[PDB]
């Protein structure tokens, strides 16, 4: 926790002469508003007066004028004068809030959900990245920095180690890292985080990304966390850890039962399923998100959930205690996280409030199984195409109250307009198959 | 469109 | 008409030495097999043999044998000894024709057809091609054969003019040709068929395609009839012009009327109109298919009929007496002919035995309308992507009718195959997109 | 545009 | 797939 | 292959 | 006629990975005197006894011909799965990839075919190995196992050796040792002929199995 003094506490002693106000759009791309230290006084007021628009991201129509309202606990001081942040959330003239502020939104579904009797919803992520090769014109390549494989010990110590210095500055910055390992594909990286409140672990999620983009290109590299960057291999994804606590105590957690879930977990995770379908274009907005939902790389492709699978919607890990925890494995790196936590919040809200009950778990009998089979013993498949997932967003309630109308609308209005810009392209994949045979 | 400048990345 | 005696007459005065038993696949592929002349009579006996597992394609599995039966009115000599061919029905080993075969296919439909009292169905295309060059290697570019536009005279007279070589080699060859013309698109020329009965204008269609691409390859060009082999331009279909007659009579022409429109022609409208999402796979079977219909190339892209408009399904042309016909405009080069004529001819009778009403056509107040407007008018969207178009001809049975249960079977599972292999590429717009901006 | 495809010329 | 050399185009 | 994403090495 | 053309002529069993390989398929019959000695015009499938034995004998001794009909390094990359060329010993009138097809004509054109043949073989040796091997199925009255059907594709190794369908040698040096023994081969070729191409091929084979392949070093060099 900071207060003002304890800003300009560290603004004097640590010469901080640039400040971030920092924030996000609809479509997760970290915004700022760059300021000379000198306005810090003007920052503090909430003062400090941009367009708005800018969150509606390339939809925006008309310039409006909002104000900034930072959050001092965000307060951190980059390594690299110095050049401080401050995460703020985003007010209309009016004093109230802007409804279509990703951050505001998740608080608002936060403070709904304390109304449950939960106090706390505490997430960790599992966010996996690619690091490419820089040309000579400093543009990326589509060579990989190493050819490690899973676990592998690839970047060993000297030359790049672009991971290892990732996590050290992450360390310095004040994170919390539990561990950090080498992915299944090439040039593929992991960095877990311990588990932290939704909005920290949101904000700690988008520094992440940004620090990792620093230091990649740092090392002359070229960091990315798009889904599906090479047809073949693994796909990156962003695997969210959840779990709820109503008062020092892990409501998930059963001391007696020797499975150690409580009814609770079971209608949690029994809405999630119910409504995965419903959230999967915000959990998955790209085009290319749904080129990772294919089979045979981990991703999950069907509703369904296991404690041991290959490729399960919602894996239960075998930690008991205060650290159980639901997974859900259908979030990718390049979705927004506050609107998929928000997205995940609800759907296990609605499970919980409707007494849901959980459809039987999953497990090896299931790899032999064509969809005809697998729907008539009640699995359904996930969306294919971003186009299927809006169709299927569109018919879906809790998604649309998770996410405000506002931000629904343009989310939707987003997401038709890049599919319909990537509908009418002619692919290489058809030159090829076609032009020669036709 | 009206917002062709928001667009300048599809097009 | 010809006959055994008339063959060996023309293999003896033209010096035939090499014959072609020509057939077609589910793909809408010219296959053909080779024999030399001294063969003759033992292809006159109908008793060539061959695998027959071709007409399936790329989803083959086990070899069979099967006949071929050539119909000898459909012979014709190649004007580049000489090389003659003849196009042949495929039989099981137990003397009936194969049921996968979709010429047999269309007459089975044509006979059926003929007991509701009609005796003809004729079929007049509008088949467009595009004309790229060739590199110094012989593999095609992107560059176009020229530069003209609509009805231009951009192939003047000297130097290539391969679309009047292509004309004129088809009216040595037999054929009866319309007219021709450049078209929108730089580089794509149409050419016109008088009209004649299905089978033969399907067979005028594959021999069309043949000769042409044959031609180009001449004049050192590659020609293609893929519906959208360029982003941006006009891609290429090839409509329908089709009409019923029952005993030297148009039965869609009513002589009293001002509108000069039967009401079988009416019901034959409505019939097309009701099952067009039921059919646009097999009208337009490819992935780049889909390409086409986008607005603002002319191609269709909702269920719709008018006699004055810029992108109809359905055009009425304002021709009358004995040359009233209906326009299906949604077809492509790249659709099998018989597959097609068969689900338009099935779709229409559907219509007239039903006694549908047909909608009321569409003017120039349906250009500014939304597809919510459209929708609450009537006005049916055609699907949009290849897996969208299967799951609606999943659900038509008039198209399961038309094709038989194999050939609907076989086309499901190629198309289906096809559609999965093209969703798991990763496309370079998606490299553009992302890569950077995640 | 309604006639993109005649308007290829310019675009 | 067992029609691996039918297959080839798409592979 | 069931665990194709592991077995990248050798397609 | 290629060199006319500007063109190269291959026939090489599996000149590219991951298409289809060329085989030179052999539909034989037996006549004795101006008759098919394989039709049986009485019954239904029209096959004579002699026919059941022919393709008994062939089936027997499939793995001792292997090597002869087989004789390149190279063409043991065609005899793998998914490409139509046979990987098993069996029988079928109707199978994606049969050691032995017996076509659906009947009559004087009533013939056997076997698949495993590729085009570089030495068309003398390998028709008399295959006549020899019939012969020896003939004169010794085999029982012709059970045809396969659709239900083989979905069958292991461990499966198919249980049913009893032995599999085709998958290497040159493993085709070699199972051509040294068979007697039915060595009777077919000849003591000289026997000797003569089991010592070029081992010979071939040995100059083969010390060369460092690209995969080789595509797959190792940098995780070793
Ligand atoms: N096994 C792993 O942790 C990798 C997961 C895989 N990258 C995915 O997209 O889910
Ligand atoms: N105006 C024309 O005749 C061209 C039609 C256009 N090529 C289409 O795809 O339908
Ligand atoms: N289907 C065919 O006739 C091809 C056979 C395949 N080329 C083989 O090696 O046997
Ligand atoms: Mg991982
Ligand atoms: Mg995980
Ligand atoms: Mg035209
Ligand atoms: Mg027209
Ligand atoms: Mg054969």
């Known amino acids: 926790t900071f207060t003002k003094e304890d800003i300009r506490k560290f603004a004097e002693e640590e010469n901080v002469r640039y400040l971030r106000l920092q924030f996000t759009d609809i479509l997760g791309t970290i915004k700022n508003v760059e300021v000379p230290v000198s306005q810090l006084e003007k920052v503090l007021d909430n003062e400090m007066m941009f367009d708005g628009s800018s969150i509606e991201g390339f939809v925006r129509i008309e310039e409006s004028d909002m104000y900034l309202h930072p959050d001092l606990d965000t307060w951190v001081i980059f390594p690299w004068g110095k050049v401080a942040r401050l995460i703020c959330d985003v007010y209309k003239t009016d004093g109230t809030p802007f409804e279509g502020d990703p951050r505001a939104n998740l608080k608002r579904v936060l403070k709904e959900m304390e109304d449950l009797g939960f106090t706390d919803f505490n997430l960790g992520p599992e966010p996996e990245f690619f690091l490419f090769k820089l040309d000579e014109k400093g543009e990326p390549t589509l060579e990989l920095n190493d050819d490690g494989g899973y676990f592998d010990l690839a970047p060993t110590d000297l030359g790049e180690n672009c991971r290892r210095d990732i996590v050290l500055e992450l360390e310095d910055m004040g994170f919390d890292i539990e561990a950090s390992h080498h ?57 969210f850890n959840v779990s709820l606590f109503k008062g020092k105590e892990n409501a998930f957690f059963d001391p007696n039962t020797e499975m150690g879930l409580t009814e609770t977990a079971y209608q949690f995770t029994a809405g999630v399923l119910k409504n995965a379908r419903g959230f999967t274009a915000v959990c998955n907005p790209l085009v290319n998100s749904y080129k990772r939902l294919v089979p045979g790389y981990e991703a999950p492709c069907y509703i369904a959930w296991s404690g041991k699978n290959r490729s399960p919607l919602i894996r239960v890990p075998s930690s008991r205690g205060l650290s159980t925890r639901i997974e859900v494995r259908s979030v990718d790196p390049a979705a927004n996280p506050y609107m998929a936590l928000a997205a995940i919040l609800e759907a296990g809200l609605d499970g ?30 996930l969306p294919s195409t971003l186009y299927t997932a809006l169709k299927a967003m569109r018919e879906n309630e809790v998604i649309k109250k998770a996410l405000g109308n506002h931000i629904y609308n343009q989310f939707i209005n987003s997401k038709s307009i890049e599919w319909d810009y990537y509908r009418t392209q002619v692919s290489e994949w058809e030159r090829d198959q076609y032009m020669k045979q036709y | 469109p009206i917002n062709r400048g928001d667009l300048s990345r599809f097009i």
Not at chain 1, 373 to 379: K, P, S, W
């Open chain 1, 183 to 239: 992915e299944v594909a090439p040039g593929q990286h992991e960095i877990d985080f311990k588990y932290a409140d939704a909005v920290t672990a949101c904000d700690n999620i988008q520094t992440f990304k940004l620090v990792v983009k620093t230091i990649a290109r740092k090392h002359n590299l070229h960091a990315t966390f798009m889904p599906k960057p090479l047809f073949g291999v693994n796909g990156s994804g962003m695997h």
């Open chain 1, 352 to 381: 919980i409030k409707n007494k849901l009950k959980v459809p039987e778990p999953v497990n090896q009998n299931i790899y032999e199984m064509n969809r005809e089979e697998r729907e008539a013993v009640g699995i359904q498949d």
